[PDB]
Amino acid sequence: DTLVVHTQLGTTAPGSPTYLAAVDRFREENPGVKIKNLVNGDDLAQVYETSRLARKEADVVMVNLYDKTLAWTDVGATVDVKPYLDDWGLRGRVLPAALADWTDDEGRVRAFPYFATNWPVAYNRALLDRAGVDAIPTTGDQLIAAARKLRAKGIAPVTVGGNDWTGQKLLAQIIQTFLSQDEARHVYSTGDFGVRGARLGIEYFAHLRDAGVFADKAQGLTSDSMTTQFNTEEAAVQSAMSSALAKVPEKVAGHTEVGGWPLADGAAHDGPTVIRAYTLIGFWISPNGVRKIEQVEKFLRFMYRPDVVARFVTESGRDMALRTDAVSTGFPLVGAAQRLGSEVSQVLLPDVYVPPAAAQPLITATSTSFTRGTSPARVRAALESAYRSV
Amino acid sequence: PDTLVVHTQLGTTAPGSPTYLAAVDRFREENPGVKIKNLVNGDDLAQVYETSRLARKEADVVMVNLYDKTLAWTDVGATVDVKPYLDDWGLRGRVLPAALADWTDDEGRVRAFPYFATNWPVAYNRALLDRAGVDAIPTTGDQLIAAARKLRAKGIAPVTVGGNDWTGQKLLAQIIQTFLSQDEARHVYSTGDFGVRGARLGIEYFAHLRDAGVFADKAQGLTSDSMTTQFNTEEAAVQSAMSSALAKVPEKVAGHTEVGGWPLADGAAHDGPTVIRAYTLIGFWISPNGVRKIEQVEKFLRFMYRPDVVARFVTESGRDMALRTDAVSTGFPLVGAAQRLGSEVSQVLLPDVYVPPAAAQPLITATSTSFTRGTSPARVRAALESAYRSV
Amino acid sequence: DTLVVHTQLGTTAPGSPTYLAAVDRFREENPGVKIKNLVNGDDLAQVYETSRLARKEADVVMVNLYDKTLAWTDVGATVDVKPYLDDWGLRGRVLPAALADWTDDEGRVRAFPYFATNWPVAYNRALLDRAGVDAIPTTGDQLIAAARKLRAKGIAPVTVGGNDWTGQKLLAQIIQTFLSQDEARHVYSTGDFGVRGARLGIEYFAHLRDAGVFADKAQGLTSDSMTTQFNTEEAAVQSAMSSALAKVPEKVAGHTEVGGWPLADGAAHDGPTVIRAYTLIGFWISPNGVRKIEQVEKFLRFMYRPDVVARFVTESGRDMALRTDAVSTGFPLVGAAQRLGSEVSQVLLPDVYVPPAAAQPLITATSTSFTRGTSPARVRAALESAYRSVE
Amino acid sequence: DSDPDTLVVHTQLGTTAPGSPTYLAAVDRFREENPGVKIKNLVNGDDLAQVYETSRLARKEADVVMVNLYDKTLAWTDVGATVDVKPYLDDWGLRGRVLPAALADWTDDEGRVRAFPYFATNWPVAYNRALLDRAGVDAIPTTGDQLIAAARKLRAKGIAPVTVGGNDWTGQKLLAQIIQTFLSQDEARHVYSTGDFGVRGARLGIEYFAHLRDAGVFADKAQGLTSDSMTTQFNTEEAAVQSAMSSALAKVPEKVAGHTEVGGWPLADGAAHDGPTVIRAYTLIGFWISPNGVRKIEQVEKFLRFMYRPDVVARFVTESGRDMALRTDAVSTGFPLVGAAQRLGSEVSQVLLPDVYVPPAAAQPLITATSTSFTRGTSPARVRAALESAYRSV
């Protein structure tokens, strides 16, 4: 009757140190409580399902929302937490958008939201100064002339991993310039880049690209090339997860500012965009958990405490799906992105909606798209073909 | 319920679907009272199946290949050991020995009934070679380079390949295995240790061929599509490809096209040009639910294992089989030719089942970087190895 | 790779057309596996035994279960097929009663059942209507009343070959009116027609005979005059194998119905009765056939496919020993007989139980019994004297 | 005051009251835990109840009150100056964290829970071994006969036996405990509420008491002693036995405490307890919620879940040496006799603390009647008459 938690945190996963400290804190606070952790990585859902069929499954699970766990709630492998969210009175602790993203098409709340991600654009002021620029929120001369001026001084503009996930996400964000979230969800879950908003998004991307906004040979770059270029100051801009901006050398981060991606005239947003997801690790409750619900509520109420939540923000520079006044003012760029607010508009992280079979092909088509000169028609063709399977 | 449910990847677009549907309809004519239903799913079958298993409504029989997601099925019991059925039904023996071995895990359990396989040879367009002045198919590296330079001299691309997707990915692994026995290869692609003498010897060989212009210009950016378009429109003279892709080579082109293996470097760990081969594509799995309808499963699997049914897949769809057959895909020239290839070519490993799921995508990325002309063997080795850092 | 089959099918035997299509299809489904048929009729057993002496016996035999083949299993001329029935998963294809009839007392299954026979009674309703008989008789008295009315109109009543096997079997069937299958097995094994059931049936027979239920001078008729009399509508009733009913002219079959033989009070059956056996042509495996049971496996699985079985029923008008849903509607009377079921009781086909030395004398004694006026005592005497040459 | 995110607590803790040091630390810890919640403390002693009522009538009373259960606060629940807390003990599963007896004693006739229990008192009997050894008594007395025998032996070496302030609250509580040798919880409830010392149980107990006293079980002149006399006599080791609140036992000089053992009061034949008996009360400072507090019930939620958290409870026990009304595994180790009293189990029977049930009008006269009763030779009839006369107001 010890509380057993099947979680992805405990070793190499981000936020692990603070989670272990929380578990040890939890024990000091509740001397008699027995809590045990079962750590698994990418194969946690598979391991959880096997123990579930054997009726030996953990009481609480900590994993993100993706392909496999997106089906748990309907098959009943995991229970709808809304009842507990209400009874315990923790509903109000969750950001409104976060709670929505974690709710069924039906009314069910898949899990207790916890982790999230801020994915803004970092601008190197010193580098923009060396040229003749200032931050930029506009498509034209602003993003493009800034790029022309940076290049004029032998400095790469925006660096991005054209041949991997970082590129796949930037392409999607830019295309989203003319797509509101509801629309992007359709585009990316079906693979219909033939919609007006998407065609305008693709054209926009194609225009910036052909003007030299991205580093030379971006189509062949990766997350490594990207972060190395920005960290050594060979490029002036980079759209990256706050978690990645967390490792920008102190020196470089001192004269670095975070914002959104420059808007094009006629955009479906009122401010430079940034990517935002609230579906990273969350707390799920299992059938075994319900039979041990009082012990579960103890643990979750503790994890939802501002006290505990601020620690994840403060000590591990984590973005959260819960309401808190804490800021990662220890991971400067991270803290700065959390302070953004309303001068930037939110766009989707395609991950959850993109069918798994279209994932790798979507990256190969992105790499084809970042190729200087590739017509919008071919861009749309490559992208859509990434969905052949389906 | 009393009706066999088959969860399969065949039925619509998957290769062999047309024949599978005939087989099913044929099965129904041979057994007037039997009820059989099909549940179709592509790359997401494994996921849809595991979910039906949670609902306790999983299909009785499963038709999917062996890859990272299904590799863990037998040990956790999501799917049962098929050995006692293969034996009791007297079907072992219909299976190619090398196929049965590849489908048996470490504990000696047979994961599933083997069915589909793959010949993955090198196609050489003879008219393009003759046009350029290469009068024979190259069997050594130097001959390959010489032919490559000659081809380029006539404005013809030598070897086409999707340097930025799965095709270039396996070709790189294949060329590297020029100096790796299959055992050594399993170890390399399993552990991500490209430091072993054979792997460096292969990486070096690959870099030499590449820097010599053996692959089409800008190959690091091509895809399976660009590759097959280039070979089919006769813009490139050589192409390594699955039997399935070769089955689609336009008639006129297939006419003056012959198959062989990849040219060997001196000191090679094989006796002749290499070709890829696997026996782990689609096979028949039995779920716990299936065991409750075992006599129904039995009637369906022995029908599927019948010589004349297997021959139809070979003869009519042009598939390669994991089972013993006298059939040859004569109706798909290059495929039939790849099936007749004997000891004049050596088989190398298709890395897929040994590669950790986390190193897969990165490995594709590291491949593109590697096809780029001038990338030192040291850097190729580093990119390949970094693909395994997330495992 | 060559299966030799010693068969009674292939030329004039019923079901030959379908057997040959089956063989041709089997090849079609199994190229490389040759099938060689050795055809023989009635004298197959002897020719087979000579083959055994030469030590070049056929692998599979297709023959009837009668005196000569009944000794085969015990001397090992043919092997027990039970271990092949179970383990090949064919057991369930066999009608329970049929499997039992093919099992000796050591529990050995002599052969794989295949052919069978429904032997009912055909009633010409047109002739019945011509006379004043409105309904098919169900009791001895109704039968006699119907025979009287038929004769008043000049129409012969029950035609039968009183001097051959047809008369032989109908007389055994009439007597069994008061005998259970087991009691009848003892009677025809022993030659003991003194049991209460045998004498009660013999008198019932005498009564019907003395009242004119049979055509005039029936004691000297044969299967020939019998079927000729019915096909030309000179006689209105005929008890006969389904195989002979399929030969009835369409115009006549058009107003013909099948049922059983009218019961006498105190009968030992729910009746009317019909003869039914499951021991006609079956598949036997010889010692040579076991040393290559691989090719035998395919052949019997093929022959036992509902698929093939239906062709025999539907295409040749064959009654089968295996379960089927098919009915020979192209041979109406056969189809009708196959559809009888409940309202008819099945009696014994004596043949297998009759010692060979009593076979012919039993026919002779049958002609005597069909002579009007021959007392029950004399009918019993002749019947029992048929067994004087046996132990 | 007033704004949400501002919890105002009217407490008797904060300065001289026992547990104040640990309460302050808990408040500051709570603040560290909830940065966005301001906490204000209004401290008052004996007049908190009066001050709270004046605030309640002006519609600006604190959100949470921390007071014990006595005459005045005993009237808050029915008139609504304070809300029923049972609905709350029930949600957020806090009941179960409360000792069954504690929760019962804090529940009125209507099944309403006046407050969240928190502080309690263990009131056992301490026996000085060093002195029992000098006298020749090698075992702590368990029965009235043995107690008397130990008293004799003790006096023979010139050592006073049981010391107690017969002219103040100590004497009045010990007399009531001894009389309770023959009274169940409910019976003692009736006896001290109505002043009816005629019930057979009180009559028997008064005999027992008179027997012990006449036998010289108490120090000479106990009738005129006080809590100070008592505390002094035991600390300088002039007397070997002393019944007293664990809070007083916590101040026993460590040298003396080293060889001191705690138990219960010896039983007479046919007592109403498996005994020996020790006094236990669970109605010292508790948490009350005001209507204003109900408005800020979300803030009150945080505060109460905190105070009821095991680690916070254990600090009160460990760092302050407080007996609690909630379940704990902690023991007042740093205050030896307190920890030993807490570790006492079934080998000691609980009797009641009269305080809550004695009409205030009888409180002072009951002490004066108690002094009279401790005077040797005073008939059981006179003891009973003096006790009953203490209730002349009713």
| Ordered domains of chain D (ranges, CATH) | 1-123+283-332 (3.40.190.10), 124-282+333-394 (3.40.190.10)
Q: Report the distance separating Cα B101 and Cα B110, nearest Å.
A: 8
- Inter-chain contacts counted by CB atoms under 8 A, chains A and D: 29
Tokens of D380: 């059981």
With contacts defined as CB-CB under 8 Å, which chain D residues touch A305? 33
Contact A30 D310 (CB under 8 A): yes
Is it the case that chain D and chain C have 3 or more CB pairs lying under 8 Å apart? no
Contact B47 A356 (CB under 8 A): yes
Which of B9, B54, B74 to probe the A interface (max A CBs under 10 A)?
B54
CA D176 to chain centroid, in Å, comes to: 13
Contact criterion met (CB below 8 Å) for B310 and B321: yes
Q: Running DSSP on this structure, what letter comes out for residue C285?
A: E
A126 touches chain B (CB under 8 A): no
C297 touches chain B (CB under 8 A): yes
Q: Report the distance separating Cα B143 and Cα B149, nearest Å.
A: 10
Q: What contacts C51, CB < 8 A, 6 or more positions away? A: C6, C57, C58
- β-strands D277-281, D349-351 pairing: parallel
D35 touches chain A (CB under 8 A): yes
Contact A29 D311 (CB under 8 A): yes
Q: How far is B55 from chain A (nearest CA, A)?
A: 6
Q: Report the distance separating Cα D162 and Cα D154, nearest Å.
A: 10
Contact A32 D305 (CB under 8 A): no
Is it the case that chain C and chain A have 3 or more CB pairs lying under 8 Å apart? no
- For chain C, give the number of residues: 391
Contact A307 D93 (CB under 8 A): no
Give DSSP secondary structure letters for A288-300.
HHHTTHHHHHHHH
Contact D309 A30 (CB under 8 A): yes
C341 touches chain B (CB under 8 A): no
Q: Running DSSP on this structure, what letter comes out for residue D113?
A: B
A209 touches chain B (CB under 8 A): no
Q: How far is A307 from chain D (nearest CA, A)?
A: 5
Q: Running DSSP on this structure, what letter comes out for residue C111?
A: S
Q: Report the distance separating Cα B104 and Cα C144, nearest Å.
A: 76
Contact C306 B33 (CB under 8 A): yes
With contacts defined as CB-CB under 8 Å, which chain A residues touch D93? 294, 297
B365 touches chain A (CB under 8 A): yes
Contact D33 A305 (CB under 8 A): yes
Angle at which helices B197-211 and B141-153 cross, to 10°: 20
B31 touches chain C (CB under 8 A): yes
CA-based nearest residue in chain C for residue B85: C87
Per-position b or e across D220-232, b if 16+ CB within 10 A of its CB: eebbebbbebbbe
Is it the case that chain D and chain B have 3 or more CB pairs lying under 8 Å apart? no
Q: Name the nearest CA neighbour of D113 among D97, D92, D89.
A: D89
- CB-nearest to A389 from B42, B360, B362 is B42
Q: What contacts C254, CB < 8 A, 6 or more positions away? A: none
Angle at which helices A165-175 and A356-369 cross, to 10°: 80
Longest CA span, chain C: 67
CA-based nearest residue in chain B for residue C25: B308
Contact criterion met (CB below 8 Å) for A6 and A61: yes
Contact B307 C29 (CB under 8 A): yes
CA-based nearest residue in chain A for residue D92: A88
Per-position b or e across D142-170, b if 16+ CB within 10 A of its CB: bebeebbebbebbbeeebbbbbbbbbbbb
Q: Report the distance separating Cα A377 and Cα A256, nearest Å.
A: 36
Helix (H) or strand (E) holding B348: strand B346-348
Q: Name the nearest CA neighbour of D92 among A220, A123, B123, A301.
A: A301
Contact criterion met (CB below 8 Å) for D222 and D163: yes
Give the number of other Cβ atoms within 10 Å of residue D210's Cβ: 21
Map tokens 């378009």 to a residue.
B229
- Structural Rg of chain C based on CA atoms: 22
- For chain D, give the number of residues: 394
Contact A71 B78 (CB under 8 A): no
A32 touches chain B (CB under 8 A): no
- Please tell me whether residue B4 adopts helix, strand or coil conformation: strand
Q: Report the distance separating Cα B215 and Cα B227, nearest Å.
A: 11
- CB-nearest to C325 from B32, B89, B306 is B32
D309 touches chain A (CB under 8 A): yes
In chain A, residues 99-118 whose CB comes closer than 8 Å to chain D = none
With contacts defined as CB-CB under 8 Å, which chain A residues touch D95? none
- Which phi and psi (to 5°) does residue A76 adopt? 75, 20
CA-based nearest residue in chain B for residue A77: B54
Experimental method: X-ray
With contacts defined as CB-CB under 8 Å, which chain B residues touch A360? 165, 360-361, 364
Q: Report the distance separating Cα A328 and Cα A258, nearest Å.
A: 14
Contact criterion met (CB below 8 Å) for C18 and C316: yes
Contact B31 C307 (CB under 8 A): yes
Contact A32 D310 (CB under 8 A): yes
- Please tell me whether residue D226 adopts helix, strand or coil conformation: coil
Q: How far is D329 from chain A (nearest CA, A)?
A: 9
Contact B54 A53 (CB under 8 A): yes
Contact B32 C306 (CB under 8 A): yes
- CB-nearest to A325 from D36, D309, D314 is D36
Compute the CA torsion angle B99, B100, B101, B104 (nearest 10 deg). 130
Beta strand ranges found along chain C (DSSP E): 2-7, 34-39, 60-63, 115-119, 121-124, 156-158, 235-239, 256-259, 273-277, 282-285, 319-320, 345-347
Longest CA span, chain B: 67
Map tokens 């040879």 to a residue.
B121
Q: Where are the alpha helices (DSSP H) in B217-325?
A: 224-232, 243-246, 251-255, 288-291, 294-304, 307-312
- Which phi and psi (to 5°) does residue D380 adopt? -60, -30
**Residue C266 Rama label (left phi>0; alpha psi -120 to 50; beta):** left
Is it the case that chain A and chain D have 3 or more CB pairs lying under 8 Å apart? yes
Contact A357 B43 (CB under 8 A): yes
With contacts defined as CB-CB under 8 Å, which chain A residues touch B44? 355-357
Cα distance from N-terminal residue to C-terminal residue, chain D: 42
Which of C29, C302, C325 to probe the B interface (max B CBs under 10 A)?
C29
A301 touches chain D (CB under 8 A): yes
Map tokens 């000098």 to a residue.
D134
Give DSSP secondary structure letters for C368-381.
HHTSTT--HHHHHH
With contacts defined as CB-CB under 8 Å, which chain C residues touch B88? 87
Q: Name the nearest CA neighbour of B284 among B4, B37, B93, B6.
A: B6
D38 touches chain A (CB under 8 A): no
List the subunits that have 3+ CB pairs under 8 angstroms with C: B
